[PDB]
Design a protein around this motif. Structure first.
Motif, PDB file in Angstrom:
ATOM      1  N   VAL A 121       0.843  -1.157   0.000  1.00 39.20           N
ATOM      2  CA  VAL A 121       0.000   0.000   0.000  1.00 39.20           C
ATOM      3  C   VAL A 121       0.897   1.231   0.000  1.00 39.20           C
ATOM      4  CG1 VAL A 121      -0.381  -0.044   2.484  1.00 39.20           C
ATOM      5  CG2 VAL A 121      -1.956   1.199   1.039  1.00 39.20           C
ATOM      6  N   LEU A 123       0.910   4.755   1.280  1.00 38.66           N
ATOM      7  CA  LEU A 123       0.217   5.436   2.382  1.00 38.66           C
ATOM      8  C   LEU A 123       0.825   6.792   2.785  1.00 38.66           C
ATOM      9  CD1 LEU A 123      -2.277   4.425   4.154  1.00 38.66           C
ATOM     10  CD2 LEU A 123      -0.613   4.131   5.996  1.00 38.66           C
ATOM     11  N   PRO A 280      -4.675   6.225   1.984  1.00 43.75           N
ATOM     12  CA  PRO A 280      -3.989   5.646   0.837  1.00 43.75           C
ATOM     13  C   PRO A 280      -3.907   6.555  -0.411  1.00 43.75           C
ATOM     14  CG  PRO A 280      -6.207   4.844   0.925  1.00 43.75           C
ATOM     15  CD  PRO A 280      -6.084   5.850   2.020  1.00 43.75           C
TER      16      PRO A 280
END
Ligand SMILES: CCCCCCCCCCCCCC(=O)SCCNC(=O)CCNC(=O)[C@H](O)C(C)(C)COP(=O)(O)OP(=O)(O)OC[C@H]1O[C@@H](n2cnc3c(N)ncnc32)[C@H](O)[C@@H]1OP(=O)(O)O
Ligand SMILES: CC(C)Cc1ccc2nn(C)cc2c1NS(=O)(=O)c1ccc(CCCCC2CCN(C)CC2)cc1
Length: 411
Positions: A121, A123, A280
């Motif tokens: 991810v 982030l 995100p």
């Protein structure tokens, strides 16, 4: 006393966390070279397995384990029953690292005994805005903003140990092995959520649910006519009338998202997500993967006017096994995923989520009080459940923030 968690790079008490001001790593810096190249030692009865998420059979094995051994509520009424198609979707986003899916099998029968999953991810996890402004005017703006750039980290989900094997300290070994595999990719932070309190969350929020099919919910959770409904005298027709919904959406211009919406959905989502302290960042590929309708799994609708996407919502399906029960084996729950409203009030956008969920046969809509989820609770008749979702970082000091400052939805 946390024989495992006390040896880990996480803040150790609510107190330590409440005196943190700036985002940053906890551990001394390390290199990939520093990290053991061999898996972490386990009993010779066991073996490390990296399942293949393109093998329907491996997905099937992960599926069965989670079906029988994954998360239950505090009273053991419900257990998650993520489908196979959901698992493939969740475990294989763009650029996923197959190495990060870590299983323990019994050497003999190849029986799956435990699982943990990491996925990539991107982030934003820099110092929250409020702390950034405080610092700015003490001359520490640069310190405070040092880690503002979105980071490519790991997101950990689906940790599960077979019931036969619980309380044997196998969960720490899975976590150490996952950490090793991730560190070997030159990733030093992870984000995770849990229903339990561990050292030490940076945010915490209640779950909220909305009945869509009050009949079935009541024959489940009570298992009869609940407190105040079998109290003034006429229940059931009263419960149905209280939770009834239109048969069709109210926002004209509401349709299913299609591949050509990807760039506009991404832009209105990103604009919205960017106002949260933790959230995100998604490429077009990631918007595609996580938001394009995928049967039985994720459902996404756009409000399009004069060929322009001005609003959207999504929800995903996790049925739960209804544990102590003859009648209905499954509760079909829709979970509020990402959304963004620019032309209408959010309660009005999410009312259509409810209508859509309901017309597709969901029993209930669930969510956590992240994003702007609180803003529609009362109006749309959600009530607090007994769950709390806690958000955590691994190897990252972070101030305590409200869950309304969090924009990462976890599956
Ligand atoms: C840079 C990369 C880093 C990446 C890694 C980041 C960290 C990832 C961390 C994981 C993120 C997971 C995100 C999710 O998926 S959250 C969902 C977790 N799963 C379930 O709830 C499914 C049902 N339960 C189980 O399967 C088991 O009970 C589990 C596997 C949870 C524990 O197994 P078991 O019950 O058989 O116990 P043990 O004897 O092996 O182990 C005991 C130790 O484990 C600690 N424990 C208990 N529950 C959790 C929990 N949810 N996260 C972290 N730790 C937990 C506990 O405090 C104790 O340590 P300590 O207090 O003595 O210190
Ligand atoms: C009966 C409905 C009204 C609500 C409902 C429906 C299905 C459920 N299935 N289950 C299992 C719990 C359910 C529940 N009630 S709740 O308060 O919203 C809650 C929701 C979730 C949890 C579980 C804790 C959260 C676990 C984490 C694991 C990791 N992850 C990424 C997300 C959730 C407890 C209560």
């Amino acid at each position: 006393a946390h024989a495992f968690w006390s040896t880990q790079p996480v803040p150790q008490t609510e107190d330590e966390t409440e005196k943190i001001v700036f985002a940053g790593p906890m551990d001394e810096p390390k290199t990939v070279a520093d990290i053991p190249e061999e898996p972490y030692p386990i009993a010779s009865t066991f073996e490390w397995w990296t399942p293949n998420m393109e093998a329907a059979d491996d997905i099937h094995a992960i599926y069965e384990l989670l079906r029988d051994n994954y998360v239950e509520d505090d009273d053991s009424m419900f257990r998650f029953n993520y489908s196979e198609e959901f698992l493939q979707w969740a475990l294989c986003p763009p650029n996923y690292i197959p190495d990060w899916h870590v299983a323990v099998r019994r050497k003999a029968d190849k029986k799956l005994l435990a699982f943990i999953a990491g996925v990539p991810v991107t982030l934003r996890m820099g110092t929250p805005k409020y702390m950034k402004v405080k610092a700015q005017e003490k001359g520490e703006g640069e310190e405070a903003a040092k880690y503002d750039e979105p980071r490519h980290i790991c997101e950990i989900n689906f940790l599960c140990v077979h019931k036969q094997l619980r309380e044997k300290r196998l969960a720490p070994i899975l976590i150490k092995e996952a950490t090793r595999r991730v560190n070997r990719t030159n990733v030093w932070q992870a984000v995770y959520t849990a229903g339990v309190l561990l050292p030490t969350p940076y945010a915490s929020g209640q779950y909220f649910h909305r009945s869509l099919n009050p009949e079935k919910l009541v024959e489940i959770r009570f298992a009869g006519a609940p407190a105040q409904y079998a109290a003034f005298a006429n229940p059931m027709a009263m419960l149905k009338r209280n939770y009834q919904l239109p048969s069709a959406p109210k926002n004209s211009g509401l349709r299913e998202m299609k591949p050509s919406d990807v760039p506009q959905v991404r832009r209105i989502l990103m604009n919205y997500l960017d106002s949260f302290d933790v959230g995100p960042v998604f490429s077009d590929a990631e918007i595609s993967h996580y938001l394009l309708p995928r049967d039985g799994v994720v459902f996404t609708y756009v409000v399009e006017n004069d060929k322009k996407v001005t609003d959207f919502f999504s929800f995903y399906r996790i049925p739960s096994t209804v544990i102590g029960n003859a009648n209905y084996n499954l509760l079909n729950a829709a979970y509020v995923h990402y959304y963004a409203a620019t032309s209408i009030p959010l309660h009005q956008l999410i009312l259509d989520l409810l209508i859509v969920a309901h017309s597709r046969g969901f029993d209930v809509c669930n969510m956590v009080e992240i994003l702007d989820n609180r803003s529609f609770v009362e109006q749309l008749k959600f009530g607090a459940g007994d769950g709390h979702l806690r958000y955590y970082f691994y190897n990252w000091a972070y101030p305590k923030i409200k869950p309304s400052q969090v924009a990462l939805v976890m599956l």
